Amino acid sequence: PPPPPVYCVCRQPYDVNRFMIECDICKDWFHGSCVGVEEHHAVDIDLYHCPNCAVLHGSSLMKKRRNWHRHDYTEIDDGSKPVQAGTRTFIKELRSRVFPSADEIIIKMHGSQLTQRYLEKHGFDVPIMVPKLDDLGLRLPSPTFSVMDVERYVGGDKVIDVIDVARQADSKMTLHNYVKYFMNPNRPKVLNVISLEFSDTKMSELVEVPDIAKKLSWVENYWPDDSVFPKPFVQKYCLMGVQDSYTDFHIDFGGTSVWYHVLWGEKIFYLIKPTDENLARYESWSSSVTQSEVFFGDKVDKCYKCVVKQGHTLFVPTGWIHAVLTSQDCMAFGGNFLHNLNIGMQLRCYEMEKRLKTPDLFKFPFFEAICWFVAKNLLETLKELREDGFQPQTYLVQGVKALHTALKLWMKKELVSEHAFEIPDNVRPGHLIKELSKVIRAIEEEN
Template sequence: MRRTHDYHRYCKSCVLEKPSRTITFKPPARKSTRKRAQPDYVNLNAGVEADPSRWLRVIQSKPIKDDEFRRMNGSDVGLEWLENDENAMKEPIVIENPEGLGMKMPDTNFTVSDVADIVGHETPVEVIDVATQSNTPGWTLGKWTEYYNKEPSTRDKVRNVISLEISGTLLADRVLPPRLVRELDWVDKFWPSTRRGKGQAYPKVQLYCLMGVASAWTDWHVDFAGSSVYYHILRGCKAGIPVFYFIRPTPANLAAYERWSGTELQSSIWLGDMVDEVVKVTLYPGNTMIIPTGWIHAVHTPVDSLVFGGNFLHSYNVATQLKVIEIEKTTRVPKKFRFPYFTKLCWYVADKYFRDIKAKEEFSPRVLESLVALCSYLVSEVRAMERGSEAAKRDAKEHVPTDRIKDAPALARELRWRVRLAAGTTSDDEGNERPLKKALTNGNGSASVNGGVKRKRSPIEMQGPETETSLGRVQFRNFQPKGWDVVEDLPKEEETATVQAVYPEEVVGLQQRWVKWDDETSGEDGGRQALVERKREITVRARKIDGGLERQRIERVFEKWEWSRVSDEESVEKGDVEMKLEDDVPPRQTDIEPHIDNQKDEEAAKESQEGATDGMELVG
């Protein structure tokens, strides 16, 4: 029923009384027939600004540094470089000549028309209207080719294609990522090859064809899941010269990006004003660039360009990859525009590393550090399975590849234990996976738990020393590290030695000199005579392993150093030395007494010793 103010309404009797009275409906409100642009989340996630020329004008007035990134030969970009250079894959690199990269690209005369001919003119493609930040529906590669081949002055709008993934097409046979990318890429290394066939679901992010026209601008963004990126600027006809702007992924800069991304700040504030610095890199036809994990970047395309590139995750900076995942969740990036099957891929990675580490394969500290972060993420997934809501449990379980992994909780926790053992850490407490918080204290000055609320101790916490393992007390479920078959404490050893050493005048000197003291050093010039009492405790433990025996010898040495009160002018000779002590204090016994007959003799001996010497407490 229409509202009463939409028409002139009369009752039936009034109409019968005067037929000229008619019910007249109000005409409907005018509605625009113009198509409204729908938001395009690909570009919103990437931060494409509605007015690209606006930011180009802003750049002219901003401090932009020229890059100092490395220019490398293609043959030098390999695993050996990554393992031996601590800065490898931490900053973008530019390879000016593709020779030696182990990469395959189309011929130098390859064009956008060739892309359409090979992939198919009727292939749907997402075309971005840069001015409205919207996806324009109804475009095919054939239609895009017609637009792209027009003279720039005759194009109706500035458009962009940034998401044409060509895996599984004939064009993919002509494109091969750089050798290093293939050697690092988690999808290539860990996703089962039998599950990467045509029609199967797997992360297809390795092969992108990007086609931009003059004046296109892609605003600040981080590639999904912090994935690293390779870009190759194709040579030949209509190859462009893109300009990249970079922001280093420091914690402060990533925090600024998180505040800026997806908010009203994105349309009104230049992100460069919120960070420490912006660096510019200009690429030329034939150049290849590799952008490492988490780097924030924007792209300006001064002329029409044709670029091939792709995304890849790797094992050399997992912590930053996971940090970007957190930012995506915080800024509510739709799942459709995140790295596809990310958690499932992490499980495949964990399964392979678990088998490798169990087989005694060694990994660099950098990889082990990344695996610690990966284990933390997967253990958090396990907690969701065990303690989360029903929806969270269901979601976490759906991400586990059951074709390879039958017991995800056990795998995550045992891998974490093995990685910590390989990395030389010793904690098995799941609480260590959480960010450290400032400890609260109770009235007695000791740390309180749960904000001062008393909690029950778990059965595992109440167990005694018999639950000790090689890494301490086990505090997680579903996995019990193998215990030691034999643990034996050898008899304690005690010895006394007299050495010549410089008396530490200050605490700073103590830290610098004595922490690095060499036990074999017999003396130092200008030093005093010091008595060193040393106690040594040795524990040996052993257990059977596959194909042999594992044995550990743990030695703890406790030392106490005491200096005599001699003047600096007195010389000290080696061997037995008779020392002149201040205030006529009886000389100190240099040998430890074998026994003291009674309590009085013991007290007297202590008083004599305390009056004659200074200890490591620096009472000198």
């Protein structure tokens, strides 16, 4: 009668859902949580020694650093192989690079001027900087709010996604362990936390997104509360990163627009305009084999450097390509949102993600689902407008049009089989597309 199979110091049966590491001495497996080993520490450990074996054999044999410019710091430091994104060398070169200032393109405003009316008239296609919090409708915890407070409200046991910046790889850690790492001024490595959405926590109550984001948001205006699909929550993110954290050039999921507020620290955004040329080069680079070794800021004509100091708020429009460097230990708040000002661009970005085979976890939850809802709503808003002697605004027309082309396409015989589980259970696809084309045709005639 053999003894039931158990592992680790806790002598528990295997649990394929928990992170484990193997002792090179006893050949047993251990829960990282039981022996104090984080998922990100695994790659640094060559041959692991559990606490028990270490007493007579010493601590784990760690891998040896031979360079400062590659994701694999063990590689010999000769001359072959270029500098990779996120490494110490990369950061040193980035800090000394010369960029045109973002002052050349962004718009500095007062919160009271940033309205829907203002964006419909001047458009929302260049980053907007709002230095003072006044009139934005943005509520945040006081400037004294610290990472320890985040733990206090969110709870130390929550599992968050962390990024090992020098490897440009991610893993999971408890908030408790992350705050513990952040509080020690002596960091063994650079770790960044960029996707801690807290709408579902006690912390959600301390934040109220900017009025302008709430006013324009698709989810805020067109997503039915009674829908069967789980409402997408990408409205409240808490960002924590130590000095030298770095996120490479990308375009927000679903072509969303974003707002960022630095509570303390300093962040530097490298902005690239979404011209057709830039978007093309971006998709090439994004899918290239040498991506990690090419600074995208060198593949375009202008890469603007935007310093966002604590207390400031930045809004970045649809499709803009940007990278971010954490200049100082930083805590920030931000959120994403879709709107009617640049539907075409939003759809363009969605399609690019499909081609690039972007993982489901890195996209706007129910993008097509919300696109149907919006179309259904805009059809009515368009009728009512004409049924009152009014000429719909050009951008809205061009937008609803772009949405028409997209919708029609998602139904094509060969395609329809995919964008199926996405179509909300209360809209008539064909009917909708038809009623749309009709109204578009009218405005395109009686105007």
